[PDB]
Symmetry: C3
Subunit: 128 residues, 3 copies
């Protein structure tokens, strides 16, 4: 039982991604945000009682590495319930290195999202 939060400035990509995630049995609750601020605002109202939550954050957006700065300010107890992933259509080796260096970014995923790739990846980070 996982919640999904998508953060993307592209309205087309936002709704499309939401559609695909719902189309699979990967999740039944998709929350969508068009801005980092609104995404951060929602997270600041959450406690450690929230379900296993996956956050899909777009790279070329505040952007991705400004979002993580505000994200790192959230209490550790709520961050522990969350697995944050970076998504992007363009992927140069410089982006990969930065995501790797960023503690909150688990992995950089390519666009469009590969559902079987992510479903397997969820086994690793949300076990049992």
């Amino acid at each position: 039982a996982m919640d999904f939060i998508i953060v993307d400035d592209s309205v087309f990509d936002l709704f499309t991604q939401e559609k695909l995630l719902l189309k699979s049995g990967l999740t039944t609750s998709v929350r969508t945000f068009n801005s980092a601020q609104a995404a951060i605002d929602h997270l600041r109202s959450q406690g450690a009682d929230i379900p296993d939550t996956v956050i899909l954050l777009d790279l070329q957006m505040i952007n991705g590495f400004e979002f993580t700065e505000h994200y790192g300010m959230l209490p550790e107890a709520v961050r522990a319930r969350i697995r944050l992933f970076m998504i992007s259509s363009t992927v140069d080796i410089s982006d990969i290195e930065q995501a790797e260096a960023n503690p909150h970014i688990i992995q950089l995923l390519p666009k469009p999202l590969e559902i079987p790739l992510l479903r397997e990846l969820l086994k690793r980070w949300f076990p049992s």
Copy 2:
């Protein structure tokens, strides 16, 4: 089953707060510290086997935002068992912003402590 740790330079406020927490069924074990050093010293001797622990830290005190620096040095495994709250009689919007920015400070609570407000807040951060 929660432990409570109060850190306040005001001896009157320290014992008074301890009294109120014991007066309610919110907790049965209240530890009180008159100094950040003694509070930090006690925490450094703890492991990840400690009960769900709430820490009430006074703002105008090392002070509050020097205590958190030493607090951030504790192992993550013991910090995960702890929910840290800032308490103060005076609350200007500048204090709120800083507490919000500080990852270890979950929320700034006003003095005197509102037990029903905190009891509800404990449901969020120490679930089940």
Copy 3:
């Protein structure tokens, strides 16, 4: 059920330590690394589904306080499954203070490793 990871540039110390840990009933799975890079590489491939893992890191080695920098870059979900300890033959009060200040270093242990000392210490950090 714990996994043990030893990181030591000394090949003699590495295999010797591995031998002692296996000699006791403290663990049955010891992974050994002769370099911080190879140790970090292995950790970067792990998820939050890994067993309770103890990491023994040698001080005079990248060294110990460069290893922790790369270690701090790992996702918090995998770090929560790990207890990291610093080990060294020489122990001046300056080393103790730095280990104390480093959030990821739980405790500095002397060489050679005292198995009963560590076994008791594991009760604190890997409870139940």
